[PDB]
Design an enzyme around this catalytic site. Sequence first.
Site, mmCIF file in Angstrom:
data_model
loop_
_atom_site.group_PDB
_atom_site.id
_atom_site.type_symbol
_atom_site.label_atom_id
_atom_site.label_comp_id
_atom_site.label_asym_id
_atom_site.label_seq_id
_atom_site.Cartn_x
_atom_site.Cartn_y
_atom_site.Cartn_z
ATOM 1 N N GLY A 17 0.842 -1.165 0.000
ATOM 2 C CA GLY A 17 0.000 0.000 0.000
ATOM 3 C C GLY A 17 0.880 1.218 0.000
ATOM 4 N N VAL A 21 4.027 -2.439 3.193
ATOM 5 C CA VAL A 21 3.236 -3.657 2.964
ATOM 6 C C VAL A 21 2.108 -3.815 3.987
ATOM 7 C CG1 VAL A 21 5.185 -4.829 1.840
ATOM 8 C CG2 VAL A 21 4.661 -5.289 4.242
ATOM 9 N N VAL A 22 1.022 -4.500 3.597
ATOM 10 C CA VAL A 22 -0.131 -4.681 4.476
ATOM 11 C C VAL A 22 -0.466 -6.171 4.544
ATOM 12 C CG1 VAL A 22 -2.533 -4.053 4.950
ATOM 13 C CG2 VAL A 22 -1.011 -2.456 3.788
ATOM 14 N N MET A 83 -10.535 -4.219 5.899
ATOM 15 C CA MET A 83 -11.500 -3.846 4.864
ATOM 16 C C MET A 83 -11.428 -4.868 3.729
ATOM 17 S SD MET A 83 -12.800 -1.048 6.178
ATOM 18 C CE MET A 83 -13.506 -0.091 4.815
ATOM 19 N N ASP A 127 -4.392 13.999 0.931
ATOM 20 C CA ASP A 127 -4.265 13.145 -0.256
ATOM 21 C C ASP A 127 -5.493 12.308 -0.495
ATOM 22 O OD1 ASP A 127 -3.059 12.321 -2.601
ATOM 23 O OD2 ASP A 127 -1.436 11.133 -1.738
ATOM 24 N N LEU A 148 -1.117 11.285 6.667
ATOM 25 C CA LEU A 148 0.144 10.545 6.662
ATOM 26 C C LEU A 148 1.223 11.082 5.756
ATOM 27 C CD1 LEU A 148 -0.325 6.728 7.008
ATOM 28 C CD2 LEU A 148 -0.089 8.519 8.722
HETATM 29 C C1 LIG Z 1 -4.598 -5.409 -3.843
HETATM 30 C C2 LIG Z 1 -5.240 -3.994 -3.872
HETATM 31 C C3 LIG Z 1 -5.640 -3.476 -2.489
HETATM 32 O O1 LIG Z 1 -6.764 -3.785 -2.216
HETATM 33 N N1 LIG Z 1 -4.882 -2.690 -1.564
HETATM 34 C C4 LIG Z 1 -3.462 -2.229 -1.741
HETATM 35 C C5 LIG Z 1 -2.656 -3.116 -0.800
HETATM 36 C C6 LIG Z 1 -3.087 -2.708 0.622
HETATM 37 C C7 LIG Z 1 -4.574 -2.982 0.861
HETATM 38 C C8 LIG Z 1 -4.970 -2.443 2.211
HETATM 39 N N2 LIG Z 1 -4.460 -1.411 2.849
HETATM 40 C C9 LIG Z 1 -5.064 -1.226 4.008
HETATM 41 C C10 LIG Z 1 -4.661 -0.173 4.967
HETATM 42 C C11 LIG Z 1 -4.181 -0.558 6.221
HETATM 43 C C12 LIG Z 1 -3.727 0.350 7.165
HETATM 44 C C13 LIG Z 1 -3.755 1.692 6.835
HETATM 45 C C14 LIG Z 1 -3.313 2.733 7.780
HETATM 46 O O2 LIG Z 1 -2.393 2.500 8.537
HETATM 47 N N3 LIG Z 1 -3.985 3.917 7.734
HETATM 48 C C15 LIG Z 1 -3.751 5.046 8.515
HETATM 49 C C16 LIG Z 1 -2.774 5.111 9.534
HETATM 50 C C17 LIG Z 1 -2.579 6.280 10.254
HETATM 51 C C18 LIG Z 1 -1.498 6.317 11.342
HETATM 52 F F1 LIG Z 1 -1.121 7.588 11.668
HETATM 53 F F2 LIG Z 1 -1.986 5.703 12.456
HETATM 54 F F3 LIG Z 1 -0.389 5.650 10.920
HETATM 55 C C19 LIG Z 1 -3.409 7.358 9.941
HETATM 56 C C20 LIG Z 1 -4.368 7.242 8.919
HETATM 57 N N4 LIG Z 1 -4.528 6.123 8.217
HETATM 58 C C21 LIG Z 1 -4.211 2.077 5.545
HETATM 59 C C22 LIG Z 1 -4.625 1.169 4.615
HETATM 60 C C23 LIG Z 1 -6.046 -2.221 4.092
HETATM 61 C C24 LIG Z 1 -7.036 -2.583 5.031
HETATM 62 N N5 LIG Z 1 -7.184 -1.860 6.165
HETATM 63 N N6 LIG Z 1 -7.835 -3.633 4.831
HETATM 64 C C25 LIG Z 1 -7.681 -4.346 3.709
HETATM 65 C C26 LIG Z 1 -6.777 -4.021 2.749
HETATM 66 N N7 LIG Z 1 -5.957 -2.947 2.935
HETATM 67 C C27 LIG Z 1 -5.424 -2.299 -0.226
HETATM 68 C C28 LIG Z 1 -4.567 -2.955 -4.834
HETATM 69 O O3 LIG Z 1 -5.632 -3.241 -5.798
HETATM 70 C C29 LIG Z 1 -6.443 -4.035 -4.874
HETATM 71 CL CL LIG Z 2 2.203 -7.954 1.470
#
Ligand SMILES: CC1(C(=O)N2CCC[C@@H](c3nc(-c4ccc(C(=O)Nc5cc(C(F)(F)F)ccn5)cc4)c4c(N)nccn34)C2)COC1
Ligand SMILES: [Cl-]
Length: 256
Positions: A17, A21-22, A83, A127, A148
Amino acid sequence: WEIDPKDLTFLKELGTGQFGVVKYGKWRGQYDVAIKMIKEGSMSEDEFIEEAKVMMNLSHEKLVQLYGVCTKQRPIFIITEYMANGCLLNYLREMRHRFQTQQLLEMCKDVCEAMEYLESKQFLHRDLAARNCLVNDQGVVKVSDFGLSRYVLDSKFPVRWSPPEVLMYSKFSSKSDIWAFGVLMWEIYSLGKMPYERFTNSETAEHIAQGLRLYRPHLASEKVYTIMYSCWHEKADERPTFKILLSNILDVMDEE
Ligand SMILES: CC1(C(=O)N2CCC[C@@H](c3nc(-c4ccc(C(=O)Nc5cc(C(F)(F)F)ccn5)cc4)c4c(N)nccn34)C2)COC1
Ligand SMILES: [Cl-]
């Protein structure tokens, strides 16, 4: 807000992401979570950690819930709501969904509620874009990665989601988030096309400098287009608030 990393069980790799990595996993053997692993050397770490702790106090049904962090190791982990349907941009692009326009408008409503909440806290996303929104197992869209970009040390800047005063003067405000929301609405109604799809970032900035705009996606009604267009007023102070945009979106849902 410190989660014990031994309470985590990693079960599936989800991909890379923004910011690292997630993984999908379980907290305490039982509860679904996402774990984002912050790329080493990428963040102003001490700033990031202090703000992360602040952002832990943000809570809204349409914001991806932050559960905690693991900072007593590197890489840093951020533990969030899982999610299941992944990134909104990818979800839009999956033609199999055969989305109805009422579903598209609901996606906009979801995001607009999250943004109204952030606005009520005077907190800028910075963003906002379909790539940063996530979709749960019930099809609900939620906002993530707010704030972020501030900690990334340092070709990546969101030119196509930026208003003229940002491109020309770096003037960031609630109204640059408004502009971005309009572009996100366009992304939704265009089923995930890239904004200004046949322009470079350079060409986009020039078109924007000339007062020219995105135009109406095929699936957006006149009423819906009027809402997204209102986010792109040349003068920042004539752009609506998220509260007004929500009220306009609700009216359209109740009519169409
Ligand atoms: C494979 C694909 C995808 O779905 N992606 C990209 C790979 C990462 C995937 C992903 N990324 C996330 C995700 C996890 C965590 C964060 C996060 O840390 N957000 C955050 C953190 C802060 C802090 F300050 F705490 F760090 C603040 C705001 N926002 C953001 C996004 C999540 C999720 N929560 N569930 C399921 C999937 N998630 C989404 C790309 O095309 C489809
Ligand atoms: Cl990964």
